A and B are shown apart, each in its own frame.
Chain A
């Protein structure tokens, strides 16, 4: 049927990132380098792209055939806190990597003295604490409900309060995790292009990152944010499954866009 084929479209692109992010950590944590800050700024993304695939890619595989929260209440607090944590840490350890990447290129003589492995831990333990402070806030506004009109008393893992009253959690995650990595990677990658035009074969791959991380987070962050304003929330299967098949597709290319297109990771992988 329709949803029988999308039990594969969800579970193979949440599987190629669930093998691609394991391909990150076995390259980082089992090589004999000095653990450079870019080896540390990506494991902060390789354990945040796991939780939106191994804890968000398959409450869709085990619930496409049921329609209710199969995990009940022991999951719909403890697994949906790990769905809003693989979102706000796989898009907030991006704007902490872009700022470390622009400072290292457009100010390289002022960034051999700041960027250190002891300083990459200072931000990543910070940026995981400051987003665990935000995803645990969901707990007091998250509980499932039951609907008795579809085929039986069946509904899945929804919202405890009315949907229109769930507005400002969805905009302070919009304006911090979508418009900041789409503006501070548009400005701070054109600055690399102005530097690389004064002395330029990699500036096309750098122009992919600005588009690919603003067109794959575009439909989810505009459909969730419009249901805070719509009197009747959008609920069809042909569009909601598409607006979060790109969320899994964004976190399956982060071991490819940020990692595999490098020069030193490929030689590090070739020795292991």
Chain B
């Protein structure tokens, strides 16, 4: 019959036009840009789902800033579980915008669907916190109650702010290394300057390599 021997030659051309559109959505490492609330999430690299893209040394990255209804993340987060790395930008200047990020980091990490994805934790506006310790207000001891007993090993330079910025970074990785199980681990950074378009490609090469260590039985 010339009908179903031609309605199946149609099916073998709709076959070969997905394996040429599926070899283009597998060549870019997707990401998931996720700031907290006006924390400089748009000033790190530079329809209703803002998908920004960039490439560094011939590796195309696609970051997916979701400007939805609110920061609930209850059901649109499972659509991004085939992703390489979440990016969690947080401004380190304020103290109401750090203890809110601590409540916004044990929800991403302690989860169900993101249990194989590692956070490239960016820190921004640290030159508005080092410029907020010379001001001398510095309510880090007042906001964070257990700050006053913290040394500063392995680091302009000032040991008062070096103990400060290492306190929150050790507070960031404290909820990280509780239940991470080696599959996914945080990768904190320090910075609003342009030296971080390499600092993600330099870090995603240790995210894939930590999968291929477990993939190829090493």
Contacts and interface: CB of A to CB of B under 8 A. Distances in A.
A and B touch in the complex (CB under 8 A): yes
Contacts of A101: 216-218
Interface stretch (B3-11, B46-54, B86-94, B202-210): B202-210
Given A109-B204, A199-B206, A262 B212 contact: no
Contacts of B212: 104-105, 108, 111
Contacts, number: 48
A109 B208 CA distance: 7
B59 A109 contact: yes
Interface string A186-225: 0000001001000100100010000000000000000000
Interface string A97-111: 000110011001101
Contacts of B29: 109, 112
A259 B208 CA distance: 21
A263 interface: yes
20 contacts: A38-B216, A101-B218, A105-B213, A108-B209, A108-B212, A109-B29, A109-B204, A109-B205, A109-B208, A113-B27, A195-B209, A199-B206, A202-B213, A258-B217, A262-B217, A263-B214, A264-B214, A264-B215, A264-B217, A265-B217
Interface string B172-213: 000000000000000000000000000001001110110111
A100 B212 CA distance: 11
Interface of B: 26-27, 29, 59, 201, 204-206, 208-209, 211-218
Contacts of B214: 263-264
Contact of B218 (A36, A192, A265): A192
A111 B204 CA distance: 13
A258 B218 CA distance: 9
Contacts of B211: 108
Interface string A251-272: 0000000110111110000000
A113 B206 CA distance: 16
Contact of B216 (A100, A109, A199, A261): A100
Contact of A113 (B26, B213, B217, B218): B26
Contacts of A105: 209, 212-213, 216, 218
A100 B218 CA distance: 12
A153 to B, nearest CB: 51
A78 B31 CA distance: 55
Contacts of A113: 26-27
Contacts of B218: 101, 105, 192, 202, 206
